[PDB]
Amino acid sequence: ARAWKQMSWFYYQYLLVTALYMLEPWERTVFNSMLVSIVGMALYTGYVF
Amino acid sequence: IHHVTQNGGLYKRPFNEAFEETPMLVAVLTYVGYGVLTLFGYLRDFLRYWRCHHATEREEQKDFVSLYQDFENFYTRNLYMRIRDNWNRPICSVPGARVDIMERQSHDYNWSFKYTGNIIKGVINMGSYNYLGFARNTGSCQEAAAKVLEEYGAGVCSTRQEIGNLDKHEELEELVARFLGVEAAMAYGMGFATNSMNIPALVGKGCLILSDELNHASLVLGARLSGATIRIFKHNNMQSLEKLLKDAIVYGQPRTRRPWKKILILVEGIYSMEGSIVRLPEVIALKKKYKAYLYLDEAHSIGALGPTGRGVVEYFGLDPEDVDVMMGTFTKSFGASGGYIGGKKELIDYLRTHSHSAVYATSLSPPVVEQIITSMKCIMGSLGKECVQQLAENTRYFRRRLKEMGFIIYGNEDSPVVPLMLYMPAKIGAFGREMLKRNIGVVVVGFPATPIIESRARFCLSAAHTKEILDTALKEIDEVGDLLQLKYSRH
Amino acid sequence: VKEKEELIEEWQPEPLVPPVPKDHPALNYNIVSGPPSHKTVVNGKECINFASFNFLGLLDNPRVKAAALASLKKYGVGTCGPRGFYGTFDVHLDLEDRLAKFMKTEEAIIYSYGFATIASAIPAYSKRGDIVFVDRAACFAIQKGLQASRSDIKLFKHNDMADLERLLKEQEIEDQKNPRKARVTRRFIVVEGLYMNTGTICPLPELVKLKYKYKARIFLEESLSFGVLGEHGRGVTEHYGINIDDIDLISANMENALASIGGFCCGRSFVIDHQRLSGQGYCFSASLPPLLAAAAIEALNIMEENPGIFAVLKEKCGQIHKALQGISGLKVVGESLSPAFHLQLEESTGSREQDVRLLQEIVDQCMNRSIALTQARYLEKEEKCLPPPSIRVVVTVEQTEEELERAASTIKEVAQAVL
Amino acid sequence: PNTRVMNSRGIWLSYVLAIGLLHIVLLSIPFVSVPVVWTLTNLIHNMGMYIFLHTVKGTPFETPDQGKARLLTHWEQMDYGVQFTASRKFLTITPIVLYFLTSFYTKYDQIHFVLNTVSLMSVLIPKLPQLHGVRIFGI
Numbered sequence A: 001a002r003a004w005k006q007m008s009w010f011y012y013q014y015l016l017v018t019a020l021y022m023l024e025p026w027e028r029t030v031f032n033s034m035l036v037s038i039v040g041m042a043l044y045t046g047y048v049f
Numbered sequence B: 001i002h003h004v005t006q007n008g009g010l011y012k013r014p015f016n017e018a019f020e021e022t023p024m025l026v027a028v029l030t031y032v033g034y035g036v037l038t039l040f041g042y043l044r045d046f047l048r049y050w051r052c053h054h055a056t057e058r059e060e061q062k063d064f065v066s067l068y069q070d071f072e073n074f075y076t077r078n079l080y081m082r083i084r085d086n087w088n089r090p091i092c093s094v095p096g097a098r099v100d101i102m103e104r105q106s107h108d109y110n111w112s113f114k115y116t117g118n119i120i121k122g123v124i125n126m127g128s129y130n131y132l133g134f135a136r137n138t139g140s141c142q143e144a145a146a147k148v149l150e151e152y153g154a155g156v157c158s159t160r161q162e163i164g165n166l167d168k169h170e171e172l173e174e175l176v177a178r179f180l181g182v183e184a185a186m187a188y189g190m191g192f193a194t195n196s197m198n199i200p201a202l203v204g205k206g207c208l209i210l211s212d213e214l215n216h217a218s219l220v221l222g223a224r225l226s227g228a229t230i231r232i233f234k235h236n237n238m239q240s241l242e243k244l245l246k247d248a249i250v251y252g253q254p255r256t257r258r259p260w261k262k263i264l265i266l267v268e269g270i271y272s273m274e275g276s277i278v279r280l281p282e283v284i285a286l287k288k289k290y291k292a293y294l295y296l297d298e299a300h301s302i303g304a305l306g307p308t309g310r311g312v313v314e315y316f317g318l319d320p321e322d323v324d325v326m327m328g329t330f331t332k333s334f335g336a337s338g339g340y341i342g343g344k345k346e347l348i349d350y351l352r353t354h355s356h357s358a359v360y361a362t363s364l365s366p367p368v369v370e371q372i373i374t375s376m377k378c379i380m381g382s383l384g385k386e387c388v389q390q391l392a393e394n395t396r397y398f399r400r401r402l403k404e405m406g407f408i409i410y411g412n413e414d415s416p417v418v419p420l421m422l423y424m425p426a427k428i429g430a431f432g433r434e435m436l437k438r439n440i441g442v443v444v445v446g447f448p449a450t451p452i453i454e455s456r457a458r459f460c461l462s463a464a465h466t467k468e469i470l471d472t473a474l475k476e477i478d479e480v481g482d483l484l485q486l487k488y489s490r491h
Numbered sequence C: 001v002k003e004k005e006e007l008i009e010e011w012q013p014e015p016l017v018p019p020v021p022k023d024h025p026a027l028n029y030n031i032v033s034g035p036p037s038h039k040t041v042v043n044g045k046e047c048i049n050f051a052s053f054n055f056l057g058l059l060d061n062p063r064v065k066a067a068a069l070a071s072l073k074k075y076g077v078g079t080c081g082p083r084g085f086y087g088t089f090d091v092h093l094d095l096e097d098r099l100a101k102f103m104k105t106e107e108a109i110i111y112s113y114g115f116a117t118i119a120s121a122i123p124a125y126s127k128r129g130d131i132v133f134v135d136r137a138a139c140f141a142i143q144k145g146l147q148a149s150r151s152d153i154k155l156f157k158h159n160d161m162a163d164l165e166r167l168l169k170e171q172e173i174e175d176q177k178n179p180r181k182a183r184v185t186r187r188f189i190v191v192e193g194l195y196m197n198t199g200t201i202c203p204l205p206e207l208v209k210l211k212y213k214y215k216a217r218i219f220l221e222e223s224l225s226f227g228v229l230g231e232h233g234r235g236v237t238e239h240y241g242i243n244i245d246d247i248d249l250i251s252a253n254m255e256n257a258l259a260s261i262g263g264f265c266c267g268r269s270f271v272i273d274h275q276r277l278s279g280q281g282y283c284f285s286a287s288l289p290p291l292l293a294a295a296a297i298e299a300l301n302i303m304e305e306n307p308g309i310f311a312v313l314k315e316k317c318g319q320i321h322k323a324l325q326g327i328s329g330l331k332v333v334g335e336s337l338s339p340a341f342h343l344q345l346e347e348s349t350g351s352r353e354q355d356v357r358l359l360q361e362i363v364d365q366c367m368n369r370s371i372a373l374t375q376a377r378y379l380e381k382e383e384k385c386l387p388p389p390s391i392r393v394v395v396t397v398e399q400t401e402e403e404l405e406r407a408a409s410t411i412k413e414v415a416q417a418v419l
Numbered sequence D: 001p002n003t004r005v006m007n008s009r010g011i012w013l014s015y016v017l018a019i020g021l022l023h024i025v026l027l028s029i030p031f032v033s034v035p036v037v038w039t040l041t042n043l044i045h046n047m048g049m050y051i052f053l054h055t056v057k058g059t060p061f062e063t064p065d066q067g068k069a070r071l072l073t074h075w076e077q078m079d080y081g082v083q084f085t086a087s088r089k090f091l092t093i094t095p096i097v098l099y100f101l102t103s104f105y106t107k108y109d110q111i112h113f114v115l116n117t118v119s120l121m122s123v124l125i126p127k128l129p130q131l132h133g134v135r136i137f138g139i
C-alpha cells in the first residue's frame, strides 16, 4: 500500500531536480507531454533497430 | 604561535576554514534546472503579446520612450516572481528567538498576496542579525531608552555641523573610542550611509582602491562615487592580493605612468554570504610591506569576535593602531540603527569637516543612542559578557553538528553565520516553504546575489538561542535534508 | 629585471588626510544639551532656535511620544536585519498605506534614511544613456545620485524657464539626427519643489505642459515643499492644484516637519514597485526602526485631523518675511512662501573665507541675545554650484509671534553694527 | 553575472550533454535519414550559438554598473572583454568539431557542404576579435 506512496516521493523527487516544482501546472503538463512523446518516440524507433 | 607561513602573517591559533568544492554530478543538474526555467520565460513573454496582471504603464497621456528594459526584468519575473513568497514575510513581534509571523498567501501564483488573519507564533528564527540577543522589549537595557524617549523625542530636525548636536552624540562618540581602543570615533545615521558618504571624502582622483570580490553594496558604491580606479582581488587570496599590490606600485595609471596618489584596501571582517573571516595578519604584514592603507569593515565582526567581543582585532589579538580606519554598525549585534567610524584623531577631525553627512544628513535619533550605550555598558560591565562565550559555544557546537550530518558548510568554523548550500533553483523554492511548515523561518539566498552554483541558504546563530532551541532546530533539519536529498558532502 | 622592481618599491604615497586647516576652520560643533525644543539651551545659553526644521513642531508633542512608547514596549528598538530578510513590520506596512492615502496615490516606498532616499532613487531609473535636466541649485542629495547614475547631466539656470527649452530643442536636433538612438534615450527632468538653498518655488504648470511638448519625465523632489504648502499640506501639487498623476515620482523625507527619521517616495505603482528590487539602499540596509514609524503615523494623524495648522504657518511666513525687509548690508533672498529663509549679505567682500567669518560674528552676537541661529554650512570643493553664504531662518508654528518679532528687531540692530 | 557564467565549473561538461541530448532526440525521428540528422544538428547548434551570444544584449537581471553592457551582446561581454581567454577558445573549437563530424557523416555531399558551411561561417565571423564592436547596419 505504501509502495504507491513511496513512488509519489520519487516523483516528488523528480519535481525538485530539473526544477519542475514551481513551474505552474498549467505549464508542467506541457513539459510532461514533451517528456512523454520524445520517450514515446524513443521506443517506436528503438524497436525497429 | 601557530603559522608564520610565508608573508610574515603571524598566527596564534589554528585557522580551519572549509570551502568544499561542489560535486560534478550536482553542478550539471543545476544548469538543467535553470535551463528549463529560462526556456519558459521566452515562452511566457511571447504569450504576453496580447491582453499575473502587470503594473500597466499609463496610457492616458504617456507612451513616450518606454521606461524599463523588458529584458533586464527577465530574472525578476520568471525566477524571482515564482518563488517570492519567502524572504519577504512580515513579522509582528520582537525578533528574538521566537517570532510571530503574519501569514499570507496568493491564489494569483505569487503575483498578489493576501493576509488571512493568521499569526504563526513561536517560530524559531535563524535569519536575523541578533547575535548578542539584544532584541527584547524586556529588561533594564531597553528600559533606559524609555526615559530618553519621554525626555528628548524621536529625532533631531537638524544637522551635526548645523544646530543638531546633542550631549548624547558627544557622549557616544567618546564611548566607542574607548570600546575600540582607538583615539576618536564618530557615529552616523545608518551603516549603509557611512561607506557611501565617507569613502568619497578620503580618496580622490589619483587614488587606487583594492577591494575584495564580494564586499557589499556599500563598499562598492563609495568606491564608485569617489572617482578612483577600482581593482578587484580574489577572496582571501593574499597571493592574488600581493600580485595586484606589486603591479600597482611598479606601474602607475594605465594612461600616464605617474605614481599613484595614495592607495588603500577595502576588506570586511566577516563576509555575510559564505560566512568567513579575512586572513587579517597576512594583510597587516603585507600593507606594511607596500605602504598601502587599510579600510576595515566590522559590520558583522564586532560583538561577534574576540572575547568580550570587540571585532576581529581582538580575535586575532592584534592592535587597533595598525588599522587606519575601522567601520562597523549597530544593527547587527546591538539591536539598534546606525554605524560609526573609528580612527586616529587627525582622521576623525578631517571627517568632522568633510563628511557628506554631518554637513547634509540629519543625525541619529536620541533614544537609539541610548540603546547603543546601555548595550555597550552591559558588554563593558544585566545580560552581559557571558553570552559571547555562549554564542561561541553555540557556534562551535552547531558548526560541527551539521558537518557530521552530511551537509556542506562554507567559511571558517568559528563564524556565526552558517551558509548552507542548496544548488537547485527548485530547492530554493521548496526549502523556505518546507522549514516554515516545520515552525522555523530561515533565509535563502537567490541566484543573482550569488554565483550560479551557490544559491545557498543562510543561518544566523544567536546567543539568545539556548541548547533546546538549537537542538530542536537540528531535529527539523535532519528530516528536510533527507527529504530533499541535500546531503551533498562526502564526509 | 627582478631587482629593478624592488628599486621602485622605495616610494612614498601621500599621507591620508590632508593638512586640514586653511587658516583655522574648526567650525565649532555647537553642543545642545537636552531636547532642541522651541525653548532650548545651546552651550549652556538658553535661547529659542531658528534652524530646527520641526515646522509642525511635532518633536514636542506627547501624543507622538505616547504613541512611540507603545511601539517601544512591544517591538523593541532596532530591526535586526534588512527589509527582505525578516525585517518588515506591520507599522512599515501601515505607514506605506498611509502615505499613499495622504497623497491620494497608489504606492509609497520607505527608505531608512532621509539622505539616501533620493540618492538611491534616481540611479534606479537613469542608467548611462539617459539625459537628466537639473536646475543647478538642487540640494547635494540630488547631486550624488546623478553622479552615481553615470548619465549625462544637462544643467540649467535656477528656477528659470525657456533656458530648459533651449536644451530641449538641442535634443530635438539630436532626435532627428539619429532616430534609432533616440528611441532608447528616455530622458528625465529633476526639479525640487522648494529649494533648500534658494528658498524659491518652481513653476510646475509651465513644466507639466512643457513635458508633453518634448516628451520627458518629471521627478519631483519635494523635501522642504512637503508638509506645509497646500491647504492640507501635500506640497506644490496641492498648492498649484494640478494633478498628482502628472508627476512620475514624488520624493520627500520624514525629517523636515515630521520629526522622524528617513525618507519615502510615493507615486504610481508602475515605478514604486521597481525600487524594491534595485533600490540599492532599500535592499541592502537595515529597515526603519518601528518606534520611529509609529511616531510618524501619528504625525500623519495629526496632519489629517487638523489641517488648520498649515494655514497659520503661511501667514506667519508672511510677517517675518515682510517685517524684516529693508535692512542694510544684507538681503532676503528667499520668497515670502518659504519658511526657510536665506539671509545672505549684499555688498560682498573678497574672500568667502573671511566673508563667513564676518557672517560668523552676527550669529555669535545673536546667540548672546538668547536667539539661536545657524550659519548654513556647505561643502565648497564638491558642490559643483555653490551658493554664497547665507544664514537660514526657520519658523515653526509654535513661535508665538510677539517673541518672533523680537528676533527680527534684534537682528535689525546687530547686523548694521557688524556692517 | 554573465561575465563569470562560462567561467564556472562544469558548464563545459553541461554544454556537451545538451547537444548530446539534442542529437539523440533528433536520432529518434521516424521520417528522417541518418545523414540529415547531422545536417539538422549542425544547423540548430549554430543557430543557438548566434542567437544566444551575438544577438541578445544586456543581462536578464539588473546590472549595478548602470547598464554599461546594455549595448553589448553576450560574447562581447565575457570575462570583461579580454578575448583570448580559456573559455572563448573552447566555444570556438566546439563548432569546428561539430563541423567535422557533420563532414564525416552525410559522406561529403555538395548540398551538405553548402548548408553546413554557412552556419559554421556565420558563427565564427562575429568571433573575430577585430570584429569586437562593429554591427552591420543594425542591432
Ligand SMILES: *Cc1c(COP(=O)(O)O)cnc(C)c1O
Binding pocket: B190, B191, B192, B193, B215, B216, B218, B268, B272, B297, B299, B300, B329, B330, B331, B332, B337, B338, B339, C284, C285, C286, C287
Ligand atoms: C549590514 C550591512 C550594511 C548595512 O548597514 P546597516 O545600517 O547595518 O543595515 C553595510 N555593510 C555591511 C557589510 C553590512 O553587513
